[PDB]
Amino acid sequence: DLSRPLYKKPPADSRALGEWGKASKLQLNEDELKQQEELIERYAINIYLSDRISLHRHIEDKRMYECKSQKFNYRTLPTTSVIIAFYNEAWSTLLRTIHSVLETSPAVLLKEIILVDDLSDRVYLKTQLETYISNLDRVRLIRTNKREGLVRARLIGATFATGDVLTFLDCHCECNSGWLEPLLERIGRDETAVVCPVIDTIDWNTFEFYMQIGEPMIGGFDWRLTFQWHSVPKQERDRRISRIDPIRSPTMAGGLFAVSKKYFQYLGTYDTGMEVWGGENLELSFRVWQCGGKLEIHPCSHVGHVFPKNFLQNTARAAEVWMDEYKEHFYNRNPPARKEAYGDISERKLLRERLRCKSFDWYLKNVFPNLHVPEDRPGWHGAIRSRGISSECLDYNSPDNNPTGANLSLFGCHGQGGNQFFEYTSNKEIRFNSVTELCAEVPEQKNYVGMQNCPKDGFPVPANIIWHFKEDGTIFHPHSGLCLSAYRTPEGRPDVQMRTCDALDKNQIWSFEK
Numbered sequence: 187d188l189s190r191p192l193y194k195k196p197p198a199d200s201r202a203l204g205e206w207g208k209a210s211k212l213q214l215n216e217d218e219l220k221q222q223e224e225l226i227e228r229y230a231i232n233i234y235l236s237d238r239i240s241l242h243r244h245i246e247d248k249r250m251y252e253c254k255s256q257k258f259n260y261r262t263l264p265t266t267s268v269i270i271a272f273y274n275e276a277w278s279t280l281l282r283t284i285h286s287v288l289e290t291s292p293a294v295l296l297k298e299i300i301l302v303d304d305l306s307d308r309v310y311l312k313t314q315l316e317t318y319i320s321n322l323d324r325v326r327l328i329r330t331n332k333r334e335g336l337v338r339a340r341l342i343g344a345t346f347a348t349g350d351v352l353t354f355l356d357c358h359c360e361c362n363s364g365w366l367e368p369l370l371e372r373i374g375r376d377e378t379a380v381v382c383p384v385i386d387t388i389d390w391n392t393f394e395f396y397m398q399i400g401e402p403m404i405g406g407f408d409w410r411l412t413f414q415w416h417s418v419p420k421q422e423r424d425r426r427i428s429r430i431d432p433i434r435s436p437t438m439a440g441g442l443f444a445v446s447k448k449y450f451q452y453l454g455t456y457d458t459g460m461e462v463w464g465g466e467n468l469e470l471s472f473r474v475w476q477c478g479g480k481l482e483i484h485p486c487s488h489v490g491h492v493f494p495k496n497f498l499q500n501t502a503r504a505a506e507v508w509m510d511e512y513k514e515h516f517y518n519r520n521p522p523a524r525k526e527a528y529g530d531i532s533e534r535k536l537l538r539e540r541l542r543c544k545s546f547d548w549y550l551k552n553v554f555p556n557l558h559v560p561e562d563r564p565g566w567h568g569a570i571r572s573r574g575i576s577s578e579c580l581d582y583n584s585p586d587n588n589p590t591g592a593n594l595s596l597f598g599c600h601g602q603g604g605n606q607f608f609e610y611t612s613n614k615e616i617r618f619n620s621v622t623e624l625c626a627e628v629p630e631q632k633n634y635v636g637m638q639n640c641p642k643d644g645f646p647v648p649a650n651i652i653w654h655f656k657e658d659g660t661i662f663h664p665h666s667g668l669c670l671s672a673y674r675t676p677e678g679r680p681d682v683q684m685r686t687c688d689a690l691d692k693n694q695i696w697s698f699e700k
């Protein structure tokens with residue numbers, strides 16, 4: 187059986203703590219509780235509990251039925267080097283990862299596990315780790331000489347790897363059965379496919395493995411370039427022939443992926459000119475697809491990750507290198523990004539040219555067509571200042587939940603976008619869209635302004651979200667027949683309201699500023 191792993195799991199034991207990835211809870215006396223809380227304070231993971239769960243536990247496989255009946259040609263699949271970087275990882279989580287890879291991966295395909303110690307200071311990660319891994323076939327340790335960060339530690343590890351395919355996992359993962367074959371099968375069919383497992387959550391407190399059932403969500407972004415999940419679009423459902431086929435993802439949705447080593451090297455690996463840590467996968471995503479490259483999530487490959495209990499320079503760098511004439515939509519909506527030192531991108535431009543990468547316009551149309559791209563027409567986006575109360579700007583401040591909870595109001599003009607950033611559209615909508623596509627609306631028969639999700643591209647614009655910015659500075663709402671007016675509450679607070687129109691009233695006069 188060429189599916190055989192290098193080491194076999196012991197028989198499953200349903201009496202054993204956390205077997206099958208089920209939740210674990212211990213009965214602890216009061217000293218034991220103190221010990222458990224101490225380790226959570228130090229590790230942000232329930233290490234007390236991890237230490238009592240088998241390093242070799244089974245995870246119950248709940249994948250789509252078609253996944254479990256797939257056949258593979260083990261003689262023709264590519265080999266992989268598994269790369270795991272760590273910094274001060276607890277013993278039991280670090281080792282459960284290693285044993286999990288060793289026990290769930292076909293021996294014929296697992297060339298090596300390369301552990302990268304990114305300048306750990308835990309004493310057990312010096313001598314003791316090397317002694318433990320000296321007993322484990324194909325497991326090697328590489329050590330950095332300085333604190334490199336996840337990406338650069340990974341690069342150092344990849345440099346030592348000689349497998350056909352690099353598979354970057356992390357230091358507190360547990361692999362589902364059959365996780366590897368679907369990645370390697372696909373890359374064996376298309377060497378430019380960067381293929382990601384579905385990343386399931388392992389509970390840091392209970393160690394329950396929560397498997398995503400059926401169709402995963404996939405990766406993209408909003409116009410602040412913050413990562414956002416979205417559902418598989420109709421175009422992608424229709425392109426794919428089976429529901430267990432790989433799914434195209436506009437951006438990477440986690441840190442776990444398999445890529446042909448030669449192909450990763452050809453693309454330039456990660457962007458080394460990044461100085462700050464974090465957010466590096468946006469730049470990588472754009473580069474793979476524009477330089478093409480496919481980025482996929484594979485529904486039959488599941489890896490669990492213990493999620494424990496900024497990087498704007500990197501995000502801006504991705505925009506400067508890749509986004510061409512669309513970067514300004516980002517800067518308009520995340521103004522602090524304009525102030526960030528994204529670094530010298532001369533070498534990156536040359537790499538893009540050498541690789542003959544396609545445009546960001548191409549990316550948007552072909553990779554992320556649904557997504558809405560703002561216009562930000564000159565003179566029609568920014569802050570909207572009141573003529574009547576000259577210190578005040580239109581301002582929408584909703585709770586973090588309930589993005590459409592509040593009413594449009596006034597607040598001191600600060601020039602920083604966000605709650606004061608708007609876009610007047612060619613479809614005559616006033617969009618409040620630094621975060622999501624929200625459209626200013628007057629509900630039927632009312633005289634206040636709220637927000638609601640904008641219509642999808644190409645679909646009817648409701649009558650009650652149409653605004654006419656008159657030549658005279660009036661913001662007229664033709665459906666209500668009223669005009670937007672500044673006023674003060676009886677208590678003195680500036681506010682807005684819909685009033686009968688009067689172009690001689692300076693409280694109904696407004697202007698865009700940027």
Ligand SMILES: CC(=O)N[C@@H]1[C@@H](O)[C@@H](O)[C@@H](CO)O[C@H]1O
Nearest residue numbers: 581582583597602603604605606
């Ligand atoms: C830049 C920005 O969004 N600032 C918002 C402001 O516009 C206003 O909504 C206020 C309400 O408390 O919060 C702010 O600091």
